[PDB]
Structure 1
């Protein structure tokens, strides 16, 4: 949660992504911090391709 908060404050992810990852973090989707970061990077890569 502290990671997601910091990422939202620095504008690395938007509100929709923050909310989704927040509910998935509460649901035991990410095993550690690096797992969450890699998922964030994957989201950002797909977003760049779409853009």
Structure 2
């Protein structure tokens, strides 16, 4: 019994011919979905509570994990990295444009103050 159990642990006697039940009977699709989605939904909690994902992207990726899009933990973590790298670019370009507009409006306000000093 222990030798056969060690062989099953290594992966032997598990071919196509020695299967006598259906795939749902062997490993249930509902149990696979429960394990898969519980892991993919508590990794987001361990990210959100610590540092990684904020309040707004959590609900979006939560519904996207509820939908059958993200296969597993590796591509979930890579998609979170891709969204974070996109958010960094979208805030950096907006900060550059805001800095240009802020320096332009600051120069305009200071020259308006100079012309106000020339008037009075």
2:84 maps to 44
User: How many correspondences in the alignment?
Assistant: 51
Where 2:69 maps in the other structure, the secondary structure is: coil
Q: Deviations over 1:1-32 (max 9, x none)?
A: 11010011012111111100000001011000
1:2 to 39, 42, 45: 42
TM-score (structure 2 length as normaliser): 0.41
User: RMSD of the TM alignment (CA)?
Assistant: 0.7
Considering Cα pairs closer than 8 Å and 6+ residues apart, tell me whether 1 or 2 has the greater RCO. 1
2:70 maps to 30
Moved over 6 A (4+): none
Larger Rg: 2
